[PDB]
Structure formats: C-alpha cells, structure tokens
Ligand SMILES: Cc1cc2nc3c(=O)[nH]c(=O)nc-3n(C[C@H](O)[C@H](O)[C@H](O)COP(=O)(O)O)c2cc1C
Ligand SMILES: Cc1cc2nc3c(=O)[nH]c(=O)nc-3n(C[C@H](O)[C@H](O)[C@H](O)COP(=O)(O)O)c2cc1C
Ligand SMILES: C=C(C)c1ccc(C)c(O)c1
Ligand SMILES: C=C(C)c1ccc(C)c(O)c1
Ligand SMILES: [Cl-]
Ligand SMILES: [Cl-]
C-alpha cells in the first residue's frame with residue numbers, strides 16, 4: 001500500500017533535479033541511495049546474494065544518473081561479525097559485486113561501495129566461532145550489557161586495538177578499496193558513522209584510550225583520518241567519500257549529550273578541507289542528520305532538536321549528502337537543496353520504492369515500507385516492491 | 400547629520416523589545432552596548448576620563464534596562480600599553496569607575512566591565528618606558544612588521560609567556576574582577592576576541608607553543624578557560640561572560656582561512672556548556688559576527704561570507720549576544736532575534752546615537768558617526784552627539 005497520510009510534493013522544480021558531478025560521476029539528479037544493509041548475503045563467506053542482489057540494485061538504478069552507495073561491506077573477516085552482510089575481500093565476493101556494478105552501470109547509474117568495520121557492534125560469538133577478536137577502541141566500556149555478556153560467554157572479551165592492529169585494519173581498507181575499484185565500482189565511502197568501529201574511536205564515550213588514538217579531539221580523529229589518507233593515496237581523492245553522524249546515538253554513541261561533539265566533528269571537517277585546499281578534495285562528505293539519531297526508530301522518533309549539521313558547511317566546501325527522514329518531508333528538502341552543493345539521501349523509502357526518483361520528481365504517492373523484511377533472507381520485501389505503475393495495477397490507489 | 404541612504408525599520412514588534420535576564424540583571428530590551436574603546440582615559444595612570452566619562456555613559460544608559468559593556472579595561476600595567484585606555488587595577492581608577500557605575504545605575508541600566516589584556520597589540524615602546532614586557536603566546540610570529548620593529552628598537556622583543564607569567568595574569572584577572580564588582584559593576588566580560596592576548600593563545604597562527612598552552616585545540620583554549628574558571632570561582636558564574644570572534648582577522652588572527660577555526664571555537668563553547676550543565680553557567684557568550692572581521696573597516700567591508708556563528712547555538716545553550724553591522728540592517732536583526740536567547744550588540748552607532756534604543760524601537764533615522772573622533776582626547780565626538788529630538792532641533796531632518 002501507499003503511505004496513507006502523506007501529501008506528496010513534486011520536487012522537479014528544485015535543485016534535487018539539477019545535475020551535479022560527484023567524483024568522476026555526472027549525476028543527473030541529487031537523490032542518492034544511502035548505504036542500506038539488507039542481510040541477503042549468504043553464509044559461509046559473506047557472499048552477496050547470488051539470486052537477488054543484481055535485481056535489487058538494478059531496480060534501484062533505474063533512474064538514469066543515480067548515485068547508489070552500497071550496503072555496508074566488510075573489508076575483511078575481522079571487520080565483520082554478521083553472517084548475512086557481504087564482504088569485499090574475497091574473489092568469490094567480487095565475482096558477485098562485479099555483476100552488481102555492471103548492472104547498475106547498464107542502467108546509466110553509479111555505484112560507491114561503503115567500506116564497513118563493525119567494532120563493538122559485531123556479534124562476539126560469530127567472531128569466536130571464526131577465530132576472530134571482538135574489537136573496539138577500548139576494553140572498559142561496552143555497547144550494552146548483552147554484548148558484553150555475549151563476549152564473555154564466547155571467551156572473546158572486547159579487545160582494545162593495538163597500534164599494529166589499527167595498521168592492519170588500514171591495510172584491509174586499502175585492499176578493499178582496490179578490490180572495489182578493480183571490480184568496477186565508481187568509488188568508496190568510508191563508514192565512520194552510526195557507532196561502528198571508526199565512530200567508536202571518534203566518540204569519547206567509547207574511546208577511553210590514553211595513547212595517540214584517544215584522549216583529545218585530534219587523537220580520536222586519528223584513525224578515521226588515517227583511513228582517509230590511505231585510501232586517497234591508493235585510489236585517489238575523487239574516488240573516496242566519508243560518512244559521519246555527529247548527533248547519532250545508535251550503537252551507544254554520545255550524540256548531543258556530549259558537549260564536545262560538534263567540536264569533534266568540526267575538527268574532522270576542517271582536516272578534510274585542509275586536504276582539499278592542498279589539492280586532495282574528497283568526492284563528498286555524507287552526513288546523517290539529527291532528524292534520525294537511530295535509523296531503527298520510526299520516522300519522527302529519536303529526533304534531536306538541539307543541534308544542526310549546518311556547521312559542516314562553514315568548514316567543508318565540497319559536496320554534502322544529507323540523509324534522515326527526508327522522504328516524508330519534501331518541504332524540508334525543498335529548503336535544503338537551495339544550497340547548490342547539497343544532495344539528499346533517501347534510505348528507508350528507497351527500500352520500498354525502486355522508482356523513488358520518479359516519485360520525487362512528479363510528487364507521487366510512496367509505497368509504505370515493511371520493516372519486518374529490512375533484514376530477512378528473502379526476495380520478499382527486497383525485489384517485489386512495485387513501481388508506481390505496478391502499484392496502480394495492483395489497485396493501491398484504492399487500498 | 401543622519402545617515403543618508405538608510406531606510407529605518409521599527410523593531411518594537413520583535414524580541415529586541417522583550418525583557419530578558421542576563422546574570423543578575425533584568426534587562427528591559429535586548430539592544431546591548433558592546434565594549435567600545437574611546438581613548439579618553441588620561442595619562443599617567445590610565446585613569447577613566449575625569450571630565451567626560453560619566454556623562455558619556457549616562458547618556459548611553461538613558462533607556463531604562465540597557466546592558467552596557469564598558470570599553471576594554473586593562474587588568475594591570477603589564478596587560479596594557481595604550482596610554483589613553485583605562486585600567487581597573489588602582490584606587491585612583493576605581494574612584495572614577497565608581498562614579499560611572501553609579502550614574503548608569505541611576506538611569507536604571509546595567510554595566511559589565513570588559514577585562515582586557517593586549518598581548519602583541521600593545522605598543523612595545525610604551526611598555527619599555529614603563530619597565531614592562533611585550534607579551535604574546537609565542538616569540539617567533541608577530542602581529543606585523545611594524546610592531547616587531549618597534550619592539551626591537553625599544554629593546555623589548557616580543558616575549559612568549561612562561562607558565563608562571565600566565566598564572567600572574569590570571570591573578571590579575573581575578574583581582575580586576577573583584578575590583579570591578581566592589582566598585583559596583585554588575586559583572587565582567589572576559590575579552591577573548593579581536594586578536595588580543597587570549598585570542599593570540601586561541602589562534603594557531605599566533606600560538607606556536609609546544610607546551611600545554613599550545614599545539615592542539617584543548618591546549619590553545621587552556622588560558623581562556625583558566626581565566627573563565629578563576630573568575631567564576633572568585634565572583635560567580637552569574638557575574639561572568641566571555642567574548643569571542645571566531646571569524647575575526649583584526650590583529651592578525653586567522654579567521655576562516657584556518658580550516659580548524661570552527662573546531663577551536665566549538666571546543667570552547669562545549670567546555671562552557673559542560674560547566675553550565677555542571678551548575679556554573681556563564682551569564683552570556685558574546686560573539687562578533689563574520690559580518691565584521693575588522694571593526695575599523697566601514698560597514699559592509701571585511702565581511703566573511705564563508706562561515707556562520709550559528710554553530711555556537713548547537714553547543715552553548717545560554718544567552719548569546721551577537722555584534723557586527725546590525726544598526727544598518729534591521730532586516731537581519733528581525734530574523735536573528737526570533738531566537739529567544741539572542742541579544743544584539745550595536746557598537747559604532749551607539750557611539751553616535753546616545754538614544755539608539757528609542758531609535759530602534761521607533762524606526763527613526765540614525766546619526767552618522769564620525770570615525771575621526773572614535774579615538775580622540777575630546778568631548779567632541781564623545782558626548783556631543785544629539786538625541787533624535789536634539790537632532791531635529793538642529794535641523795538634521797533637512798541636512
Ligand atoms: C535497514 C537499514 C539498513 C541500514 N544500513 C546502513 C549501512 O549499511 N550503512 C550506513 O551507513 N547506514 C545504514 N543505514 C542508515 C541509512 O543509510 C540512513 O542514514 C537512515 O536510514 C536514515 O535515512 P532515512 O530516514 O531516509 O531512512 C541503514 C538504515 C536502515 C533502516
Ligand atoms: C572605536 C571602536 C572601539 C572598539 N573597542 C572595543 C573594545 O574595547 N573591546 C571589544 O571587545 N571590541 C571593541 N570594538 C569592537 C566592537 O565591540 C564591535 O564588535 C564592532 O564595532 C562591530 O559592531 P558594530 O558594527 O555594531 O560597530 C571596538 C570597535 C570600535 C569601532
Ligand atoms: C554495515 C552494517 C552491517 C550496518 C548495519 C546498520 C547500520 C545502520 C549501519 O550503519 C551499518
Ligand atoms: C581594549 C582595547 C584597548 C581594544 C581596542 C579595540 C578593540 C577592537 C578591542 O577589541 C579592544
Ligand atoms: Cl501508512
Ligand atoms: Cl549474524
């Protein structure tokens with residue numbers, strides 16, 4: 001069915017429908033698919049779904065010139081810990097990714113691989129089964145009681161990374177980025193948001209380190225910036241973006257309750273702009289809005305009203321993708337895209353509307369999403385959401 | 400004469416004319432007199448002007464319930480270096496300040512002493528004459544060539560403060576604050592703006608130190624925050640505000656060209672909010688806007704468009720005074736004061752309009768200022784600017 005109470009607005013008369021170049025890619029509009037984990041990858045080996053993933057991405061690439069950021073993809077076994085999320089370290093994975101990237105390109109769209117590392121959000125028992133550590137910035141603060149208890153039961157207590165282990169992750173980011181580009185991706189997004197490993201280093205709640213990787217703004221940002229620099233060196237700044245969620249609380253991040261949080265993220269933005277002014281400007285910065293501090297709460301819930309991401313624009317002068325509860329709020333998008341370097345990521349409603357871009361241009365009803373199939377080993381709720389035309393044929397204009 | 404091309408707007412229907420409490424003071428409107436050095440203090444001894452200063456402040460206190468921040472006042476001889484700016488360290492100075500504070504209070508207005516320390520902006524020859532150092536954060540970067548050369552000619556090369564000398568300044572801030580309160584002031588403003596000593600520590604251009612007072616965001620902010628904490632302890636948070644100019648370039652500060660500048664100031668704001676949440680909220684934060692990066696350039700010049708101070712509001716949750724080119728821009732004020740904790744400082748046009756507040760409420764023409772008498776040892780251009788009524792009697796409605 002269509003979302004019942006929604007009053008759509010046609011956005012074709014806004015900058016959402018003006019072309020923009022991101023990295024090497026000439027986008028034809030500014031509605032971006034943000035990274036969306038869907039848990040269709042198969043075990044063993046974290047293999048992108050051999051039956052459905054091509055079709056899923058093909059559907060969502062249908063509007064020419066769309067920027068797609070993939071679901072988070074683990075850079076190595078040690079970076080993972082969910083059996084049904086894909087990786088980008090093995091030949092068998094890249095065989096499937098190549099098919100996905102080809103299909104998106106055949107639709108005249110673009111694809112950026114999000115490089116993911118879980119840290120304390122991983123399942124310690126899966127990691128123990130596979131002979132892997134349970135990693136984070138620190139060893140004396142935990143995501144929650146259940147995770148801490150699972151780690152102890154698995155004889156896999158949370159481990160504070162050594163400097164050498166940080167260097168090994170960086171080597172894996174580099175190789176994962178190389179693999180992604182070689183398989184045909186247009187670029188990569190470094191996931192430093194949503195309370196995963198890099199964010200665990202950025203945040204003073206999760207990072208109690210007293211070495212050069214914690215204990216100050218510069219030190220907490222060090223790992224993220226080392227990954228940035230390593231990937232810029234390996235594959236070029238034009239093929240690299242960075243995702244941040246300054247006000248996020250998901251995965252036990254601090255959000256606005258931490259009075260130093262804006263300074264922490266302003267420092268990162270400044271360091272990116274410094275690199276840009278020195279000739280190495282990242283393709284984009286992707287921000288999760290305080291509109292959505294936890295993406296598993298219904299739209300309108302978990303909204304933080306005490307802060308804005310606008311500060312980033314005073315600092316970083318390149319493209320900015322903003323995501324969080326924009327599908328239901330065309331009135332907000334209309335204002336945000338008056339800024340000529342702003343793109344809008346649409347997450348949950350791209351799950352349910354493969355033709356979302358047409359719907360945004362034309363002010364059409366939106367298909368309701370089914371949260372129960374966000375993570376599910378099924379084609380259902382993955383590749384069977386209808387286009388607007390198909391929904392009309394199903395009678396949804398009368399459901 | 401009145402400013403020729405100005406189209407006034409009545410602001411009486413805005414929050415500029417709603418009461419607000421700042422520290423202990425019940426303001427009746429939100430038009431603030433920011434600190435304005437006028438150079439009428441007499442030498443020797445940096446004595447507030449015995450002939451005219453009472454009248455100057457009395458005139459500008461005339462609208463009941465006005466917050467006045469004094470001209471910068473040196474906390475000690477070593478903090479000074481301009482012969483005609485006043486101090487707040489001696490009995491002879493405080494005799495005159497007491498008369499000024501009494502007069503402002505008789506007009507049912509309020510007065511906050513700005514505590515000033517010059518650092519590298521001081522004249523090294525005046526300091527040498529008086530047996531004093533020429534101080535800054537560092538000893539290897541200078542305000543400009545002329546200052547460096549004057550220092551060398553005076554056998555008074557710029558001196559990087561030792562930790563003990565920083566502690567001695569802090570002792571002087573404390574005593575100056577105590578003196579101010581004992582003489583009747585309502586509070587003090589710590590001057591950490593406009594490229595004076597504390598700002599020389601905040602800014603990475605002027606602060607090349609490698610000890611705990613430089614080399615990182617936290618370290619560069621240390622002196623400012625130590626002064627904050629010392630004054631909060633001595634006289635109470637309700638009697639202390641802080642002035643900052645994130646985007647200022649006056650006195651060779653970095654402004655927006657420094658990509659880390661927003662992070663530097665966001666850190667300070669965060670540390671203030673941390674103290675506030677722990678029970679010690681400063682009375683206000685006073686920001687100079689990027690509208691005016693140098694207050695000795697005509698309105699509209701030196702405007703930085705690449706940054707906003709709005710980030711501060713995501714961090715600090717108390718009152719904010721904003722200053723910079725607002726008199727000529729009632730349309731901008733009308734928007735800014737929709738925020739219910741925003742006050743507006745009017746500097747240059749308070750020099751020329753003793754009854755500025757009435758003029759703002761009622762949308763009246765503004766007296767043109769005479770920059771030549773901003774700094775002058777004269778009553779002329781100090782206490783002889785007319786009220787609106789007096790200007791009409793002089794025929795200015797036809798000049
Ligand atoms: C099912 C689901 C999976 C997600 N997976 C990821 C992910 O892999 N990487 C990521 O950075 N964000 C992920 N997110 C967050 C989204 O990219 C997005 O920031 C968030 O859903 C808010 O945007 P929206 O309101 O348009 O959905 C996910 C969100 C959902 C609901
Ligand atoms: C003559 C003059 C003297 C000033 N003296 C001081 C001072 O003592 N302390 C201070 O913090 N700012 C000082 N300022 C800066 C003003 O407080 C204010 O921030 C600036 O003039 C911008 O506001 P305006 O456009 O309303 O004048 C001075 C400005 C002028 C023009
Ligand atoms: C990479 C993974 C598995 C993932 C899952 C959910 C979210 C919100 C996310 O940011 C990342
Ligand atoms: C305290 C002094 C003498 C002073 C003079 C000018 C400006 C802009 C200022 O901030 C301070
Ligand atoms: Cl619905
Ligand atoms: Cl799992």
Ligand SMILES: [Cl-]
Pocket residue numbers: 401402403404767
């Ligand atoms: Cl004029």
Ligand SMILES: [Cl-]
Pocket residue numbers: 480481482483522525
């Ligand atoms: Cl002088």
Ligand SMILES: [Mg+2]
Pocket residue numbers: 139157158159
């Ligand atoms: Mg241990």
Ligand SMILES: [Mg+2]
Pocket residue numbers: 370372
């Ligand atoms: Mg169902």
Ligand SMILES: [Mg+2]
Pocket residue numbers: 538556557558
């Ligand atoms: Mg020396």
Ligand SMILES: [Mg+2]
Pocket residue numbers: 769771
């Ligand atoms: Mg003259």
Ligand code: NA
Pocket residue numbers: 008009010011363
């Ligand atoms: Na419409």
Ligand code: NA
Pocket residue numbers: 051379
């Ligand atoms: Na199938």
Ligand code: NA
Pocket residue numbers: 310313314707
């Ligand atoms: Na802005």
Ligand code: NA
Pocket residue numbers: 375
């Ligand atoms: Na789950």
Ligand code: NA
Pocket residue numbers: none
């Ligand atoms: Na269905």
Ligand code: NA
Pocket residue numbers: 407408409410762
């Ligand atoms: Na009017």
Ligand code: NA
Pocket residue numbers: 450778
């Ligand atoms: Na006289």
Ligand code: NA
Pocket residue numbers: 308709712713
């Ligand atoms: Na705001």
Ligand code: NA
Pocket residue numbers: 774
């Ligand atoms: Na002068």
Ligand code: NA
Pocket residue numbers: none
């Ligand atoms: Na005159």
